[model samples]
Target: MAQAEVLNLESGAKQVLQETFGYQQFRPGQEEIIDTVLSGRDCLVVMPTGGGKSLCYQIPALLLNGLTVVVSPLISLMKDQVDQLQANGVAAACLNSTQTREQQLEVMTGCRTGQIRLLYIAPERLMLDNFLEHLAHWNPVLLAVDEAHCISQWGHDFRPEYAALGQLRQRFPTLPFMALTATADDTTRQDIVRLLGLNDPLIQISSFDRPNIRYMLMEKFKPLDQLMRYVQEQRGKSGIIYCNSRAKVEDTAARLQSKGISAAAYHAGLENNVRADVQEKFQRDDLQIVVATVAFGMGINKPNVRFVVHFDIPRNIESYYQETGRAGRDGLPAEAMLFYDPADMAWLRRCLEEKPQGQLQDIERHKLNAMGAFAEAQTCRRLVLLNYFGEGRQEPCGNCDICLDPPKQYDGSTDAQIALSTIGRVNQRFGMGYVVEVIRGANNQRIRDYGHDKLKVYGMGRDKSHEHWVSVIRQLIHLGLVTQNIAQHSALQLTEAARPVLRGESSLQLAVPRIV
Candidate 1:
């Protein structure tokens, strides 16, 4: 809660900061977390991006007697982190699948020789049969988990592979393991502890607020027009524009390039080598803005990220904040602008509705609802976002779009037409799930299954999400227009009463998704 007090830190910490990182003093919560790890205690740290989470554990690793094994979720990021550590004059190495057997054995030899201060490992590599035996020969005093929130099944970036990490505590009870993440809500924090098997550890939260990053939102009124206007204003600066699918990542990048903007697309669908090169170029300052999906930005250490734009609503608030937090990491004034459409929320909800009953599904739907509420917030956007993580701001952040420029309300009869027409064009053969693939312009394998990719309605939702469209459908259902046939596998069917609207004999009036 208080600023870091370097003078009060345990012995050897101050020297490590000066000698290794060359900082005059410690940052927020840095001293306390470092001391806790060194004092033979585990902790779960919920800190923000650029909060120096690495230092909390890294400094202790140098003082500890055994290897400091860091379990990182980002495979590509390991080498970059190690390179930076080595540059900082710290002994660090990452062992992952990219290394040959001979190369990995070299790191193991370093571990045996007590020459390595930090050993970065993937959860998968840590669980390997041969690798585990090799690692057993060495005593690791600390087990630090980066992006620790992923250990939770309910987390926005949940990875089942991380579940294997629970075994670390079982194998080494004396190991003071600390779990750290940049963004996590209350539910996710508790999940992280239980799932990681963290012993009743000290929990520290260094505020969810990113005061340097101005938060802004634009309603998808004239979606492309809105995006282009914002992009044009931010030219010649490093930024990331997030899309919901690989197609939009590619299409948006090309569209921006056509406008003479130096841009590239990054997504999981891209070749591994291609993604690696784009990230390398971005980090090297050769590339400017990168239009990408949720897959981008994790474990990236680029400091001059000037802005982050969300072209489509993210799956949840955690994902939204984490992506936007990528900007302004350099502690300079930057922008986090989100183009919101309630249709995106509706689309997300309908997809959730189709999933089998489970507590995980319930938590996900609730998170989506929170995200929609934040998008529609009339108060300061930062207040709403921060509150979602169980932290309250005393006053409105004077830097957000709501606090900067008030929003406008508009008629949405045309938007509703596009949504319903998308359903009609698909011949009403599928449920909201199929139509979701149609709108928001999603481009996963589902679209290619049965060749929905070739259909006219695919990716037609543009910036709209399923939750937003489900609202319109609900209103239409109240009007007895579209019939959701439960017996027909929840496929929506056209009702005879919908003839007038279908024939253009009727006009509809509706509220636009909170036009920001």
Candidate 2:
């Protein structure tokens, strides 16, 4: 019966998993995806990083009849995967631009003669006319697209080269295709299924939660001292510190070195060889920390990283998730510390404003807003993160700082009305700092010069500390009662939803801001 054969193939997959891969069991969600591929069906897999996504295709590579051509976006990613596969005694070879002509031809000859079981390639190389024609002789049984989110324009990191990959489906009609990524929201997910032209693919989404990694967002006060203390406490543990700029990367690494921390900086500005050296040193534990820009850890296979520190806020939640997922990969307890600086956020907004105006800009701004809200989150931070990715977890994750010391909430009806009215009285002309200053009744030259200290709303919130009022206004912004006009000198604009609150028609509750 057909059912009998399915069972046999399932057992055969497990046999290969143990005998060839040296694993006694497949991680949760891996077995079913492998079964789908081995059963000659296409699939889309969205598993969190370190959830063992590689094995989904790797096990099938060993059990299947012919070559498994993996289309990866980065040469470094391909090289790492190929190296790991070969070390496991699997015949995997990658074709990339870095290889010499003879070396490429040698791999090609091996693949052509059916000696290579897995052939890794870049998306650009995979879409070539000649390469599509050559796949026929190679007789690839499965086509795997790694970092599959790149194929969707709606994805955070999109590539035009990945867009043409659907042609591979048309070329090899019956070959099973698998699309895999660690991050993709609803829009990106739908786009991947449609754009890849997948044949009714089995959509498997593993839980987005990485419980072993504790998330902590600290408001940046004396950031250098805070960073030094945090890093010093983490002595002898391997970690990464991510910054938003090249100069920060270099500066932070040097500062850590001055304090006797074994560290190095990495960014695109560095020489290729230098970058490679830093990566190699970090991989072997010769370097204790890497203070680098956001692009450093895309395909890093190092698993013993004990912590990750965000020296500045990230551009979006997906980037945060992907970068933080790099830690605790060995299934041990790890920490993710983010130092939140409002100036860093403002810098990111300015950068986004400089981008060409279009749907792309709109998407980036939307993602940035979400990232801002996450940094200012008052509820369980992990829950907020999971909710952003369309996963619902009612119970609070006990691993995050928020869960350990929950923010206190109180009736903020009076404060909300005062803050909303302050923005309105300013004629929506000023930014948050100015409004907060007006609320707390600052006797500054700027206030006196504007002659706005005489306004009815001025000094209304003077009873609260400057930081307290700032927190109140920030919560107002996060609650959609007020908006920061990034295009208009970062002015504060009240929304229609604020009308009811301003009129005392609706009661409000807000978290007590963490006063430094």
Identify the candidate with maximal lDDT.
Answer: 2
TM-score for each candidate, following the candidate numbering: 0.73, 0.78
Regions of candidate 1 where Cα sits further than 4 Å from its true position: 1-11, 130-136, 269-277, 280-286, 405-516
Model 1's TM-score against the true structure: 0.73
List ranges where model 2 is wrong by over 4 Å.
Answer: 1-8, 269-277, 410-516
Record all residue pairs in model 2 with backbone atoms less than 3 Å apart, i.e. clashing.
none
Tell me the tens digit of each residue's lDDT in model 1 across 322-387. 889899787899999889888888888898889998666766765676577667665567767765
Question: Which of the numbered candidates is closest to the native, going by highest TM-score?
Answer: 2
Candidate 2 residue-wise lDDT at 127? 69
